[PDB]
Amino acid sequence: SGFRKMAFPSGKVEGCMVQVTCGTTTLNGLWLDDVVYCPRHVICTSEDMLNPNYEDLLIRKSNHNFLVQAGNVQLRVIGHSMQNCVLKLKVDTANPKTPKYKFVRIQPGQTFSVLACYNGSPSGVYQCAMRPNFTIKGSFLNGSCGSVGFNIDYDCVSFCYMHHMELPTGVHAGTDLEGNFYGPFVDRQTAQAAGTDTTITVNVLAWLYAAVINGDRWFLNRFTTTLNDFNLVAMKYNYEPLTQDHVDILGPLSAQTGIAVLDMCASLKELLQNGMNGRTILGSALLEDEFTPFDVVRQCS
Amino acid sequence: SGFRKMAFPSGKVEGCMVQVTCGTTTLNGLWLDDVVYCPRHVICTSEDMLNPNYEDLLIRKSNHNFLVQAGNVQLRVIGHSMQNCVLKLKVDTANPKTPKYKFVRIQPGQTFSVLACYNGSPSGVYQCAMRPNFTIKGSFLNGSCGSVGFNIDYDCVSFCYMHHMELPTGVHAGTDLEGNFYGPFVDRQTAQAAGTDTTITVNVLAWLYAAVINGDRWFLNRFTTTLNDFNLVAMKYNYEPLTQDHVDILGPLSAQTGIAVLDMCASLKELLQNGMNGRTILGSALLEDEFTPFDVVRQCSGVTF
Ligand SMILES: CNC(=O)C[C@@]1(C(=O)Nc2cncc3ccccc23)CCOc2ccc(Cl)cc21
Numbered sequence: 306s307g308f309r310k311m312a313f314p315s316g317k318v319e320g321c322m323v324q325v326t327c328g329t330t331t332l333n334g335l336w337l338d339d340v341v342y343c344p345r346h347v348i349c350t351s352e353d354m355l356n357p358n359y360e361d362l363l364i365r366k367s368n369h370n371f372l373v374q375a376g377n378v379q380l381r382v383i384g385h386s387m388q389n390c391v392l393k394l395k396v397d398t399a400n401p402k403t404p405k406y407k408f409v410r411i412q413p414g415q416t417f418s419v420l421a422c423y424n425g426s427p428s429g430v431y432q433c434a435m436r437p438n439f440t441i442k443g444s445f446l447n448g449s450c451g452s453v454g455f456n457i458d459y460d461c462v463s464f465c466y467m468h469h470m471e472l473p474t475g476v477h478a479g480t481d482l483e484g485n486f487y488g489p490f491v492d493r494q495t496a497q498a499a500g501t502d503t504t505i506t507v508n509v510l511a512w513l514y515a516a517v518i519n520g521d522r523w524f525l526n527r528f529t530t531t532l533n534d535f536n537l538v539a540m541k542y543n544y545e546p547l548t549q550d551h552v553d554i555l556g557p558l559s560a561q562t563g564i565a566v567l568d569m570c571a572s573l574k575e576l577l578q579n580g581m582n583g584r585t586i587l588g589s590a591l592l593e594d595e596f597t598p599f600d601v602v603r604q605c606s
Numbered sequence: 607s608g609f610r611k612m613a614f615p616s617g618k619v620e621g622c623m624v625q626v627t628c629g630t631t632t633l634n635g636l637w638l639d640d641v642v643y644c645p646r647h648v649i650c651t652s653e654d655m656l657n658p659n660y661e662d663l664l665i666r667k668s669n670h671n672f673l674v675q676a677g678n679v680q681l682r683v684i685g686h687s688m689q690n691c692v693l694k695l696k697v698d699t700a701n702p703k704t705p706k707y708k709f710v711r712i713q714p715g716q717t718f719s720v721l722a723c724y725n726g727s728p729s730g731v732y733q734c735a736m737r738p739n740f741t742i743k744g745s746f747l748n749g750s751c752g753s754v755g756f757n758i759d760y761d762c763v764s765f766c767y768m769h770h771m772e773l774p775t776g777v778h779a780g781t782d783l784e785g786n787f788y789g790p791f792v793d794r795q796t797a798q799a800a801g802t803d804t805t806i807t808v809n810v811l812a813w814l815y816a817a818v819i820n821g822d823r824w825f826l827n828r829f830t831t832t833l834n835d836f837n838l839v840a841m842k843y844n845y846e847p848l849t850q851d852h853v854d855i856l857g858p859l860s861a862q863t864g865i866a867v868l869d870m871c872a873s874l875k876e877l878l879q880n881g882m883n884g885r886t887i888l889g890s891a892l893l894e895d896e897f898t899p900f901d902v903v904r905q906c907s908g909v910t911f
């Protein structure tokens with residue numbers, strides 16, 4: 306029993322965190338095999354942040370301009386290339402702590418663990434979700450760029466995120482490990498705004514199923530709804546539309562608890578209308594949307 | 607910016623998790639140097655658990671009865687002893703991944719990271735606080751016994767908890783690494799109940815300081831209070847008393863934000879008597895009490911491990 310926001314054990318990722326310095330800028334890099342991945346903005350100076358020409362800035366750099374530190378050992382850079390917004394620094398040593406890994410690009414609503422690092426040193430681990438506006442509500446200070454988001458599949462690390470920037474609202478934007486930004490963001494200091502965020506409806510429903518599995522049933526009702534009627538109500542509370550895919554994904558939890566997805570959807574409509582009335586669901590007074598249906602099943606079964 | 611419930615990096619602890627099997631029972635063990643620590647109830651059957659004589663059960667066991675697995679390598683047990691509610695299995699091999707570590711007993715209100723394990727394999731890491739009723743509101747399934755709680759100080763792991771049981775309300779009870787239970791709990795199948803819980807006042811104040819640091823200021827007010835007037839109000843809402851030690855501990859956050867502790871206490875007092883009024887603090891509609899003042903400083907300054 307019990308339900309917690311739970312991150313994956315970060316050990317496999319900790320052994321890949323290195324410090325990458327280029328001039329006066331220092332951020333984190335991910336050392337996998339003989340390659341160190343880091344945000345390409347590490348090559349930017351003061352007047353290269355509004356409109357950097359990364360191809361032009363990178364051509365002017367040599368391997369000896371990149372100082373890579375793995376623990377108290379300086380790694381030697383033997384090559385450099387750029388793939389979208391990620392810089393790849395070929396080093397002269399394969400990381401002996403390289404786990405089995407994959408680079409996976411995730412979709413909004415997907416959760417992952419973040420290993421927050423400063424100066425190539427891991428300081429904390431927390432669980433995040435990719436918001437529907439493609440930002441993450443992380444916890445990052447200056448120097449956290451290059452900190453990564455990941456999931457663990459048995460013994461395989463799926464790297465899904467690398468931190469690049471903080472938007473004016475305090476939310477964070479980054480890329481997958483191929484340098485492709487999540488969202489319409491660019492790695493420039495030009496005026497950028499996170500779109501209006503919405504609630505990840507499928508995740509809230511998955512979390513209501515977690516609550517039912519844990520014995521919290523007060524919010525349940527005798528109602529069901531059509532998918533269309535649910536979405537009309539949901540949109541009014543800034544909730545993401547629930548697709549038939551989401552309904553299918555909730556199938557196992559629906560079967561386990563004996564509460565049809567559209568039946569749980571009617572509970573959600575009611576909760577949105579009434580609020581909680583001083584009650585909590587899994588120790589929370591708000592509807593939690595950072596647990597996917599996969600997370601709920603993994604944590605409960 | 608941003609404020610998250612954040613655990614310590616679990617890598618130093620992951621290298622210590624092993625699987626301990628005794629008969630039909632399989633749980634987790636902590637392999638440090640040449641010793642594997644695990645809950646002593648691993649030696650119990652179902653009948654034994656009802657009224658266990660652990661000294662009697664342990665004397666009947668031999669070293670070969672304990673199957674210890676570190677990855678896909680079976681460790682050979684060369685000795686066994688019991689220290690309170692923890693079993694210590696002496697093994698022939700010192701764990702090469704043994705970090706710098708200490709066994710520390712924590713106080714209620716103190717937080718720590720839990721590395722949830724099943725079959726000696728770490729599956730998740732989460733942060734939590736030792737509740738004032740000595741339970742932890744963890745997330746544990748069958749097979750999680752032996753999962754440990756820890757903090758990291760510099761490069762030293764301080765092991766503070768080992769999971770032993772789940773109470774009927776779904777809350778968890780366990781021991782320090784010397785086998786001493788936190789709370790009035792015993793390791794036996796019998797009627798046990800978690801006491802009425804209280805809110806960790808110093809932690810709520812620390813979290814209000816984290817909210818101020820992050821730009822959430824709506825709850826701040828012009829008022830201040832005496833420590834005694836605050837504690838009279840706090841006791842009424844099942845909040846732990848705030849000591850002068852707690853006020854001193856909040857000193858750095860008080861200086862950083864320019865809000866005196868008793869000034870923040872009057873904000874908390876109003877939040878208790880009046881509520882949030884539909885507003886949130888750090889995305890939460892409830893007062894968060896699982897961030898200590900040290901956790902807030904560490905997260906709002908970026909201390910690394
Ligand atoms: C020195 N340069 C930087 O720090 C990179 C920077 C950035 O957002 N860094 C940070 C990321 N996360 C948390 C932060 C908390 C506080 C301050 C900085 C933080 C800051 C300057 O504007 C941009 C614009 C585009 C891009 Cl891709 C990166 C950046």
Ligand SMILES: CNC(=O)C[C@@]1(C(=O)Nc2cncc3ccccc23)CCOc2ccc(Cl)cc21
Pocket residue numbers: 306647655746747748749750751770771772773778792793794795796
């Ligand atoms: C096989 N026996 C056990 O697992 C030990 C057991 C226990 O609480 N295990 C669990 C601990 N945490 C999460 C659990 C989730 C579900 C089920 C079991 C869980 C279960 C039997 O009663 C007791 C009584 C005292 C003590 Cl010290 C241990 C126990």
